[PDB]
Design a protein around this ligand. Structure first.
Ligand SMILES: N[C@@H](Cc1c[nH]c[nH+]1)C(=O)O
Ligand SMILES: N[C@@H](Cc1c[nH]c[nH+]1)C(=O)O
Ligand SMILES: N[C@@H](Cc1c[nH]c[nH+]1)C(=O)O
Ligand SMILES: N[C@@H](Cc1c[nH]c[nH+]1)C(=O)O
Ligand SMILES: [Mg+2]
Ligand SMILES: [Mg+2]
Ligand SMILES: [Mg+2]
Ligand SMILES: [Mg+2]
Ligand SMILES: [Mg+2]
Ligand SMILES: [Mg+2]
Ligand SMILES: [Mg+2]
Ligand SMILES: [Mg+2]
Ligand SMILES: [Mg+2]
Ligand SMILES: [Mg+2]
Ligand SMILES: [Mg+2]
Ligand SMILES: [Mg+2]
Ligand SMILES: [Mg+2]
Lengths: 297, 296, 296, 296
């Protein structure tokens, strides 16, 4: 029934050069994702530092993502969450009027809505557009969790809501979700446990690691979707070291560092309050990167 | 250092037909003035800061500033953000609009490092010339301002004069005031108002004081005069309401209580915040019965 | 390495009038063997090991050893303790009384360091010549056996062949098997039996199998045979019972369920364990109605 | 109610060639007596209770009881267990051997329910006629004694006169004394000794007092006399050592410090406890240099 966006997906970093969005590098990075088997890209999400982007930069990165993926099978799942419902509705409509195929909408952060409030929050979002809406649960960042019951109720009550991106380190909850609502699309939000989530019936990943190693995250996901769990687990095991080191500090500090170390972006620039990693963690990321075959452009 | 301390209220923002009830806002703030409160915090967490428009945000700061003119009560305006350039803009805004200082919560959701938190607050502190109070609430932000970072910011930036602590960590409050006794430690958790003050805390930014400003004001001023027996006795008496006011996420219970007390006209929130459950509504009403609530 | 893997049951210890019901104990083990179980764990956490006398500990190990003679079912005896010299004595005891291997939980309460945990288990491993399975359950012990410590112990001590994981941390299970794929990772949490097995885990030590031995043994054997579809569907039906069996601290719900199913005569615990609340008693009864419980 | 309050020391248990140094044990207790300590706690957590033999347990209680005869110092013997019948035996043991009261930690590892904790402690309290102090340390036991359970036990059983809290939860300490101000709240965390005392706590059971008994004793008695300025100044002064004494799991740092101060002859632990890392050894030595350490 439901319109879905699944498979291997990349939470795109937003490269900056002299405090401005590096627009051809942004486009150059997405084409690199397309050519390495990625099924969808997520502009202006957490890994893209949406929280510090201006309104316009937000529009520029969605429009570049939409245009770069034209004429390919690669979908654009635009970041559109906010802790204010009227703001999240505006972001959802914004992503729709600018050509996104669907939206990722993170649970409200900081203001800790109740489960009832989360239901009304997402119901208002789902009714505002006619494109797929993927919930994003990351309690370590938001201070709140969308309960299994709330996710399932939203999936059943609102046409557009087709699943949830899980970044809670709780494989029990992933069993809980798919055992009581097996029709939903559970999406891995934690690279280290990509395979365990997929092997339980998860239908995709929204990846940080795929920024650096899109081919490996792509192959992992597609192996698992084709039920080649031995080959999916083998990439997951090989990726564990980089999957962990990419969170030595808060994402996207390590991944942007690695992208810079790989020569895939020109400057190691963040928007405050994000900043360069410690020099110790800088060295750790560079060291761990050395075992992986990093595709160029 | 210029400071803003004493008994302070995290002001609720009353809504009427989904729009800011400006007259009730002013009436609630003066009600605070008349009950011994030393400072008010407009457009903070308890004020549903996150969901207000730019104009509403301006309207409530301006009302607060205006209502406090001609009194000793200071306006400590909410100005935090998880984007440094946004927080700098909010800081400048509050300054330009007559606020006596700013409360600026640690960046939420994007989890900056300690180094990033330092640069975040340094940029905010250099952007204005009014006192800046840090706000640490890791349960809401996903982030913590370490003791070392707080102390470094206090020592390096003239405007940063202390921290509002909402971490349930009296150990950290000992850590803070034992290594930097000059800072102003402000209670951000009503239930442990007295323990924080008794260790050298110099004020509270209270949720409960919305409902019981006279008791929170007396508690704080007793404690500041080292009348610890009387401060602790008010803290002990207030425990039941202090807990029930977080039966659901603040400000859902306090707005419910303010509505039950007839102090605001509508039990209206801005989504994703909403009315409490029917059971918690009744629990709040039940606990309120043991307290004497001042009218207008 | 000698290993003990597959579908395993953490045996409850039935009491009658404050005494170990030896007949029931043998009959329950009898029942597990007949439903495809590969090994039984006497005198573990689910068996209320902490409150058994020396005599009772001995009794239940010997009954387990006796009941599994002439079958393929191994006896993996509980032998952990937070005192190394006591754990060595328990390990030697289990070997002297016919156990095929030992489960040895990480020291509880005294929170040893990783270095101490390494020395603790090396002393245990050198004390016997039978396989040793580590048991990590930080929610109960207050300590964690780190991945590095587990891997070092697996490589440095012949008898140590894997770890029972009860940490709600599938990341650690990836960590373990990605860096030491030769070890035997055993599920200690029934609800996530399949995810652990599907990542290369080689068995479960189950609470649910006390009640539903046929379903837990089929799940494990399906997964071990790389029939992950059939393993996952049994894991999915078992979720409701897997969760309700921990509505209160194990083994309070499983003994309640065993009593409700008529598999044990009395709902008796040894203090400080006790009957569940009346609400949770009814909840366990309600969840059981969807399942087909095998009798004797 | 009969109570045991004031400044109290959780005694380390010195070992020499794997055996309890009985002479050193007595000499250490006499040092505590001579430095203002009001009570000593033999065979507790800091004394490595979990790894002592029956004989050693009794030897250390008898040495403590004998050494404190003719002094104002009471013996609050460790007597907790996670098995109620074992804890009852330990309670009767301490009473029959001259202890003035017992400390009884919440059952560890097996996670009893609040109902089970109530029945656990009621049986212990009925078994003896000397004061019983509860010990809540959820980070070690995996369980918490709720405020309601503590208050119920205090009200229903004569011997239960308070609780030793090691939960880093000053909110709970407000909760306890706001609803039951007659109980004796005892600090189980040295860093927050003063905040607990200034809220109405009536004593400490201290790790730091092993090394600095005069300073912990002065802190407590200043606080008990409502000299909070002087009590807080010692608490602030002690923060660095109070923190470093848990760089690793207690009693690893305190025994290291006692050995570095020449107060015990060998840095020996019973496994799974062990010497600290070389880094933390040096850190402990560094922080110790800022303090005046009394000899014998
Ligand atoms: N910084 C605010 C507002 C914002 C969103 N995107 C850009 N700015 C937030 O994270 O919600
Ligand atoms: N909702 C966003 C932006 C905002 C602040 N105030 C109003 N809107 C935040 O909480 O940061
Ligand atoms: N109750 C103690 C001692 C014991 C073990 N088995 C029986 N008693 C423990 O759990 O370690
Ligand atoms: N080690 C077990 C048994 C014991 C207690 N005291 C000495 N041994 C426990 O801590 O409960
Ligand atoms: Mg459907
Ligand atoms: Mg396969
Ligand atoms: Mg992160
Ligand atoms: Mg703020
Ligand atoms: Mg064991
Ligand atoms: Mg041998
Ligand atoms: Mg349990
Ligand atoms: Mg268990
Ligand atoms: Mg005496
Ligand atoms: Mg004890
Ligand atoms: Mg604390
Ligand atoms: Mg008294
Ligand atoms: Mg006096």
């Amino acid at each position: 029934d439901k319109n879905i966006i699944i498979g291997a997906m990349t939470a795109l970093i937003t490269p900056f050069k002299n405090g401005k969005v590096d627009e051809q590098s942004y486009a150059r990075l997405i084409k690199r994702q397309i050519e390495n088997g990625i099924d969808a890209v997520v502009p202006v999400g957490t890994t893209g530092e949406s929280a510090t982007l201006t309104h316009e930069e937000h529009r520029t990165c969605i429009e570049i993502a939409v245009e770069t993926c034209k004429g390919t099978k690669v979908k654009v799942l635009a970041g559109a969450g906010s802790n204010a419902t009227h703001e999240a509705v505006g972001l959802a409509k914004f992503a729709k009027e600018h050509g996104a195929d669907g939206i990722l909408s993170v649970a409200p952060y900081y203001n800790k809505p109740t489960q009832q409030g989360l239901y009304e929050h997402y119901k208002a979002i789902a009714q505002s557009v006619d494109i797929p809406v993927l919930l994003y649960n990351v309690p370590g960042r938001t201070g709140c969790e969308i309960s299994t019951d709330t996710i399932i109720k939203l999936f059943r009550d609102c046409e557009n809501i087709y699943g949830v991106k899980e970044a809670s380190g709780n494989i029990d909850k992933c069993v809980d979700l798919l055992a009581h609502e097996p029709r939903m699309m559970l999406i891995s939000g934690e690279d280290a446990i990509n395979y365990p989530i997929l092997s339980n019936g998860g239908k995709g990943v929204i990846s940080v690691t795929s920024n650096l190693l899109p081919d490996m995250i792509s192959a992992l996901t597609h192996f698992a979707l084709d039920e080649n769990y031995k080959e999916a687990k083998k990439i997951n095991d090989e990726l564990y070291n980089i999957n962990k080191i990419l969170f030595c500090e808060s994402n996207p500090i390590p991944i942007k560092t690695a992208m810079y170390l790989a020569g895939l972006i020109e400057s190691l620039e963040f928007r405050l309050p994000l900043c360069s990693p410690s020099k110790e963690n800088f060295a750790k990321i560079e060291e761990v990167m050395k075992k992986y075959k990093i595709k160029g452009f």
